[PDB]
Amino acid sequence: AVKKIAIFGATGQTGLTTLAQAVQAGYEVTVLVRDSSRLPSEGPRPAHVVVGDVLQAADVDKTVAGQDAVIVLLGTRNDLSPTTVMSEGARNIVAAMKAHGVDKVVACTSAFLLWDPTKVPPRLQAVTDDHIRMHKVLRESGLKYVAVMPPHIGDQPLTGAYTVTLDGRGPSRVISKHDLGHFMLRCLTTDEYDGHSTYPSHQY
Numbered sequence: 001a002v003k004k005i006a007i008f009g010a011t012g013q014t015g016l017t018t019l020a021q022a023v024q025a026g027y028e029v030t031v032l033v034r035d036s037s038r039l040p041s042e043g044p045r046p047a048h049v050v051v052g053d054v055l056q057a058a059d060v061d062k063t064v065a066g067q068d069a070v071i072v073l074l075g076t077r078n079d080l081s082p083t084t085v086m087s088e089g090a091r092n093i094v095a096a097m098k099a100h101g102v103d104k105v106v107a108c109t110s111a112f113l114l115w116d117p118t119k120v121p122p123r124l125q126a127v128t129d130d131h132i133r134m135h136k137v138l139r140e141s142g143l144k145y146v147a148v149m150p151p152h153i154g155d156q157p158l159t160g161a162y163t164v165t166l167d168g169r170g171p172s173r174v175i176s177k178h179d180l181g182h183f184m185l186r187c188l189t190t191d192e193y194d195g196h197s198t199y200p201s202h203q204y
């Protein structure tokens, strides 16, 4: 079973609660963060903190070494500019996984990669193009990859009661950040989504 995990993007909206949940659930968690002041003091704390950048291969390598699995919650916060941060980060993550024998990655992109790809709002198209490059990197890696493709990420409570479909259709177009993190952790204990795209959603 998975015991040790690396989380990328642990200081973001979904990352923070995924990290807290993972520690509370018993995982030994390593995070890569550019700025450690973005980690909280209260609540559950990661076992290991690497300060650095997902665009630096050595930093990623140090974070992936010795892990059982990797969670990817990289994003651009409010920046909608053309970008390759997520896909280049994923390239480094894949190389570090292969260098260290790690074979399980659960990574978040977005439901736009399931929905009609001509239905993306213009201001999200640049970020979505890099999600598509990241998804390609991970699908072509030869590793066990769960693609998590959520709809709008909300702040509703943790429920653990959301629905997961494989095609982008579901009870709603929202998932709470807490439920999304819960689902990323669920993917560590089953192979049933390996090689699949998944759509978590719930009516809150």
Ligand SMILES: NC(=O)c1ccc[n+]([C@@H]2O[C@H](COP(=O)([O-])OP(=O)(O)OC[C@H]3O[C@@H](n4cnc5c(N)ncnc54)[C@H](OP(=O)(O)O)[C@@H]3O)[C@@H](O)[C@H]2O)c1
Pocket: 008, 009, 010, 011, 012, 013, 014, 015, 032, 033, 034, 035, 038, 052, 053, 054, 055, 073, 074, 075, 076, 077, 078, 085, 108, 109, 110, 111, 127, 149, 150, 151, 152, 153, 154
């Ligand atoms: N918002 C929505 O409704 C929605 C819906 C579906 C999919 N998504 C996608 O879901 C994913 C998760 O979104 P989120 O809102 O939880 O993310 P977020 O709040 O944007 O957080 C992005 C995370 O990535 C880290 N990061 C960015 N650049 C990095 C770099 N060069 N090196 C290391 N770490 C870096 C950020 O670190 P810092 O703390 O250092 O900035 C932060 O931890 C994103 O890809 C987003 O596009 C969002």
Ligand SMILES: CCC1=C(C)C(=O)N/C1=C\C1=NC(=C\c2[nH]c(/C=C3\NC(=O)C(C)=C3CC)c(CCC(=O)O)c2C)/C(C)=C1CCC(=O)O
Pocket: 075, 076, 077, 078, 079, 080, 109, 110, 111, 112, 124, 127, 128, 150, 151, 152, 153, 173, 174
């Ligand atoms: C109608 C409800 C709604 C809303 C008021 C939003 O802000 N997004 C949204 C719905 C969705 N956003 C999605 C993806 C998304 N949002 C986002 C963030 C921003 N939206 C913005 O306007 C700005 C500015 C953002 C950046 C700060 C992304 C890039 C993340 C990033 O780079 O920002 C991505 C990818 C997605 C699959 C949705 C369907 C779910 C549904 O309910 O249909």
